Each structure stands twice: as structure tokens, then as C-alpha cells.
Design a protein around this ligand. Structure first.
Ligand SMILES: Cc1cc2nc3c(=O)[nH]c(=O)nc-3n(C[C@H](O)[C@H](O)[C@H](O)COP(=O)(O)O)c2cc1C
Ligand SMILES: Cc1cc2nc3c(=O)[nH]c(=O)nc-3n(C[C@H](O)[C@H](O)[C@H](O)COP(=O)(O)O)c2cc1C
Lengths: 120, 120
């Protein structure tokens, strides 16, 4: 039996590119990625599940934006950042990335939710 | 924001005593316990959340039934066992315990769900 991770999505996220990660696993890997994510990025589920989402970054991604995300995750707070991301075919797009922490009833950090929106 | 763990309950479990545990944490602690569980066992949420459910066992609990549960968990399969359990006030009851594993989209074990039913 498989956990319905999508039952933890916000209303805005249902038709969105969204990723859930497990920060209690080494390197905070994705444990769920929506079909919209896979469509936008050009990957199959097998290519990305269980990997840290940094594979979306590429040669012109700003390293300070990457460090900003890393510190935002450590802060365990809601944040949004515009970051240059890349599809499997090498094409680049500005990604408005919104991340929020999700806690268990004890109050321990449980998951991160990250929603991607191409900036048009 | 808090994960709706109860959104992973089976239909029969909603008005039941149920526990979810996190086997990736040391000693497989409870991360969710229903109000029906707390009512039947006589505990407050603070007294039991984050503890392994073996606190339900007591002086006349059969140690082979305990070992059976331990092996069933290692097997990652659905199982049910009748085991003598105890409330905080020391009173004892026969517990028909049903446990099932819950996996993530990758297929890795994610949670255990355990439902308690007093045998009448
Ligand atoms: C749920 C989640 C979703 C993420 N989505 C993206 C994303 O869409 N694009 C991106 O560049 N980084 C994303 N990240 C950030 C990377 O996974 C990583 O945290 C970032 O590169 C900083 O960590 P690092 O310095 O170890 O690489 C996401 C992180 C999480 C936890
Ligand atoms: C989700 C879950 C619910 C459990 N519920 C009970 C229970 O109601 N009564 C009980 O005696 N053991 C219950 N257990 C079993 C104990 O937590 C523990 O696994 C058992 O005592 C065997 O492990 P041990 O030999 O380390 O004690 C439950 C275990 C899990 C994972």
C-alpha cells in the first residue's frame, strides 16, 4: 500500500509542478514528484525520484540563489525565489520556486514541499 | 503546517484506535495516535507520542507474541495478533492488533499503521 503524498498538497498545488522531499534521508531526496513536474522538466519518474532536486540547476544558475535555498531550508520557513533552472534537453527557464516545511504532530520536521512555476 | 497523517487511514480505521509509526527513526516511534487510542489506554498525547508502542505491554504479556510482532514488522507484511495489553491504570485487555506497512512512491518502507481492537 502506497502513501497518498498528494493528500498533503495545498489547493494551488494540485495542477502544479510539485515535489516532496524527505529531509531525514541523506541529501534530502525527492520522494514524490508530480506529473506536471516531469512534463515541464523532460524527465521520467525513474530519472529523478530519490534524487536531490539540484539536478534542475545548470551552468548559468546563480550559486548565491542556490545557497539562499540551502539556508532557507535550514531555517525551516516558507520562502520563494526566482532561480534559473534547466530541462533535460538543456533548455533554460526562470523558475519561481516556493518551498514550505511540513511537520509531524510532534512538531518535528517531516517533509519539504516545493512548487515550481515558470516565470512568464 | 502539519501533515494530515489520518488521510492515510483505511475506511475501517477512522473511528478506531490507530497508531502510525516511523521505522526510519530510532526504535520505530509513534508519530500519530488517534484520540480513540488515547481514550482506551488512559494516556495523554504527550505521554505516548514519540515512544515505541511496547509501553502497551505488561507483566503477563506473552513474550512470544511480542517476538511475533517484531518479526512481522521485519517481514513488512500485513498481520494480526491477539496480545494482552495494559492501560495506564494497570488494567489488562486482549488487543486484536492489526499492522500493515505503508510505502512511498519509490517503494521504500515509509510508515507502519497499527489498529487496536479490544477482543470482546
Ligand atoms: C522540495 C524541494 C524542492 C526543490 N525544488 C527545486 C527546484 O525546483 N529548482 C532548484 O533549483 N532547486 C530546488 N530545490 C533545491 C535543491 O534541492 C537544493 O536544496 C539546493 O540546490 C541547495 O542545496 P545544495 O547547496 O546542497 O545544492 C528543491 C529543494 C526541495 C527540498
Ligand atoms: C504502528 C505500530 C503499532 C503497534 N501497536 C501495538 C499495540 O497496540 N500493542 C502492542 O503490544 N504492541 C504494539 N506494537 C509493537 C511494539 O511497538 C513493538 O514493535 C513490539 O513490542 C516488538 O518489538 P520489541 O521486541 O522491540 O519490543 C506496535 C508497533 C507498531 C509499529
Amino acid at each position: 500500500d502506497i502513501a497518498d503524498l498528494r493528500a498533503l498538497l495545498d489547493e494551488d498545488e494540485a495542477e502544479m509542478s510539485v515535489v516532496f522531499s524527505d529531509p531525514s534521508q541523506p541529501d534530502n531526496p525527492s520522494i514524490y514528484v508530480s506529473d506536471a513536474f516531469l512534463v515541464q522538466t523532460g524527465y521520467t519518474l525513474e530519472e529523478v525520484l530519490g534524487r536531490n532536486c539540484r539536478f534542475l540547476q545548470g551552468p548559468d544558475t546563480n550559486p548565491h540563489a542556490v545557497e539562499a535555498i540551502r539556508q532557507g531550508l535550514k531555517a525551516e520557513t516558507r520562502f520563494t525565489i526566482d532561480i534559473l533552472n534547466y530541462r533535460k534537453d538543456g533548455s533554460a527557464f526562470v523558475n519561481r520556486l516556493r518551498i514550505r516545511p511540513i511537520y509531524d504532530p510532534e512538531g518535528n520536521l517531516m517533509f519539504f514541499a516545493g512548487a515550481q512555476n515558470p516565470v512568464l
